[PDB]
Structure 1
Amino acid sequence: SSLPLSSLTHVLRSLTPNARGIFRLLIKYQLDNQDNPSYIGLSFQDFYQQCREAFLVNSDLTLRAQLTEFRDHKLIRTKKGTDGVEYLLIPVDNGTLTDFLEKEEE
């Protein structure tokens, strides 16, 4: 067809409030860097620094526990990077993320 929009909407209602701010933060940096053809994804060092800058997670082991319900729902996955850094990407359509910021205005 594309993917049902009810799946991405009913997944954030039953989600913790701290996890919604993390999903809405990675979508902003994805579209701003989408024009770059060499986009390999953000690293883990800069991702851990951005959490405390936007009052999110406090430690590292608690941040990894917040990514358990995202990898099981086919939202994000990790790749074996050669630089020892686990990349973070969202295997969805390019037009799906553009229609997500318009439904969160309320």
Structure 2
Amino acid sequence: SLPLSSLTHVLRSLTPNARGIFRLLIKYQLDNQDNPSYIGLSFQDFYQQCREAFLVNSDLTLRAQLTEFRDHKLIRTKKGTDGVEYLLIPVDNGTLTDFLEKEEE
């Protein structure tokens, strides 16, 4: 797993909204970490959530952003029973927690 400081270093060269996007995805993973049936959010679901937080306004920009995240190994996808891609972050949840506690006091 990637350490907190490498994670921060990747994120600091992105835009404010990209950081928001990543934090929103963290929050979903951490809030559901004790549920073995949570396998992540679909793109359409996450897109709508990002749109409601004024983090993104097009399919295109979100998709570009997730693709950049994947190349940095900050997202992974897993196909559901339905053939739909579900989004998770392949970083230890302790590290992700520490990240949120720094990104606000």
Fold-level similarity (TM above 0.5): yes
Structure number, greater radius of gyration: 1
| C-alpha RMSD of matched pairs (Å) | 1.7
SS in 2 for 1:102: helix
Gaps of 5+ in 1: none
CA contact (8 A) 2:3 2:95 kept: no
Q: Distance in 2 between matches of 1:38 and 1:54?
A: 25
When structure 1 is superposed on structure 2, of 79-88 and 66-75 the one drifting more is: 79-88
Deviation at 1:3, TM superposition (A): 4.1
Distance 2:2 2:20 in 1: 23
Cα displacement string for residues 46-79 of structure 1 (whole angstroms, at most 9, x for unaligned residues): 1111121101211212211112221111111223
SS class of match (2:78) = coil
Name structure 2 gaps, 5 residues minimum: none
Percent identity of paired positions between Structure 1 and Structure 2: 100
Normalising by structure 1, we get a TM-score of 0.86
Runs of 4+ in structure 1 deviating by more than 4 angstroms, as ranges, are none
Residue-pair matches, total: 105
Query: Cα distance 1:103–1:44, how it changes in 2: closer, same or farther (>3 A)?
Result: same
Task: Provide, for residues 16-59 of structure 1, a one-character-per-residue CA deviation record: whole Å limited to 9, x for no partner.
Answer: 12211100101111111111122211122211111211012112
Match of 1:50 in 2: 49
CA contact (8 A) 2:4 2:98 kept: no
From the superposition, tell whether residues 3 and 61 of structure 1 become closer, same or farther in structure 2 (CA, over 3 Å). Answer: closer
Choose 74-83 or 94-103, whichever is displaced more: 74-83
Give the whole-Å Cα distance in 2 for the aligned partners of 1:79 and 1:100.
24
